[PDB]
Amino acid sequence: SAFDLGFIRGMTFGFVGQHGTWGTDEARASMRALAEQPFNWVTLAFAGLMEHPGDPAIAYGPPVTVSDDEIASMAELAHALGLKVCLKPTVNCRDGTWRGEIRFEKEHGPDLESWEAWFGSYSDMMAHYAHVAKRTGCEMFCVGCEMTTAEPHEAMWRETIARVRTEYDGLVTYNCNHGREEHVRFWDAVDLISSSAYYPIDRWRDRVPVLREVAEAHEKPLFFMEVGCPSRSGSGACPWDYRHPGAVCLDEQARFYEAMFAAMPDEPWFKGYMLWEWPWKLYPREAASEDGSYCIYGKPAEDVVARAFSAIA
Template identity: 45%
Template sequence: MNASPATPPPAAADDDLLGGYVAGMTWGWTGGGRGTWTGPGADASMDAMVDRLGVTWVTLAFGALQDTPQSTTIAWREAPTPTDDEVRTAIRAAHARGLRVCLKPVVNVRNGTWRAHIAFFDVDVPCEPTWAQWFAAYTDFMTHYARIAAEEGVAMLCVGCEMVQSDKREDEWRALVAAVRAEYGGLVTYNCDKYQEGAVRWWDAVDVVSSSGYYPLDDWEAQLDRIEPVVRAAGKPFLFLEAGCPSREGSPALPNDWALPGAPSGEAQRDWYEAAFAACARRDWVRGFMLWDWPTPLYLATDAATDDDYCPYAKPAETTIRDAFSRASR
């Protein structure tokens, strides 16, 4: 990838913060990490994503680790987190391809616990870790990348992803967003988890409401009915900052379960995408998707039929996604 700065795409008009429909894909998470975000494999992956899906946005997502759900230090300067140079290079590569970028730093737990379970006592107890200690570390983590986002002309910064147990800490999240805005003038969003859209009481602090859209194939209408009043009340643009389904038998009924047993099935993945796009196309308040996800480096196209993960590369869902993005972007 070219390491020299590239001019980012024009900013969105004042009356449309997102600049139109968000036809996006998440890049760099699966198979990613330090050492994978640059070089020929990364270049080929990003080129294929643009050429085969017709995306106009990309989320550059990467993780940093804390040891346990109750740890109060985040090792974002260490592997597997990509280096700052790698992050900047990927941003510039996306801009050079005409994409608008959402930068998405995410905290994960080294022992494998899902980040949604990061939590501390509601009332501080002597000798126990506290929310204040964790948010101090998390603010250092997030403001570091806010500065990079500002310097590189990133269009949107996601300040958190699926932090379910922390969602209720309204004062701390408002302070975090304020600290980010002191460093970064672009759009700010928070990616709440599926089913949690109504649990976040501080949507007014961000510019864009977003959530993870891993809803069962036959449940999209009911879930959109539930989400719509939340979005209308917030008065902010809404998109699914994550959404996808593994190419695996059974996954359309439980698309958030990345380890669900089942034989590889590109048709099952395609069916889920067809249902998701059809339901959302009837809701003018759904402004788009950042689908999950596109790895670097990519698997071989000849291996697509046996790959049962989320990436749609060289699978039947690829055509469904490209066609849906093309229609929605007209």
């Protein structure tokens, strides 16, 4: 199931999944371009919104996010184009606080500003989208992304995952942040270990042994639910940073992909790459030189990825 999952050659699509954006002509065209790349997977990623990082409320569905029908439309299109589909609901905060830093005054209390209450809201959201994933035939479901502060609430994560399993029969992953692979204590509750592997160029080769050790320790395959780099100067030193000041630099993004592919071994514990990311509104190829985003389309990284992925299979 997980052990002989085909190696993942994937791309994340459509973040942050603002309401209505995936039902556009642009989105459908962008998806068609995505499916012409040597990818076997797409991740449909979107974010619900927290009013603040200590408020347990989460806003999702219309008018904030893509509707359930928009999700179904994109999944149906991806599937019709021969892609496998991972559904990835997550949360952002309106004030810009990183989702990995949410925190509550209290551990318990359904009506208090508590971890219990937040997990209630979050489990409600994940259960809803896990059900959408099952009905739309999505081959994977990602139960969380980069939730560093939430991770120590192990029993609450296991409750959330158990509920997802009631609603969804496919592969389940949790996506931790880079540097958290060895720290998460509930990997046994998921099928695949994954991370947001935004390792600086210089750090790849030294990090690989720990990634191997984590996979082998937990007897689970490991893959990258996010990995990528903006085409901006200096970005390979801070590939996670989407607001890095700098000149457009296509070569820097290529250097990141070269370093990553050179570092990762051809070993069975590693199950591949969910690249970050592809926009719902895709620029024409000729405009790639003015683009400072994570998108590889029309840049030298597209060819680096092509050379690696076509040869992988």
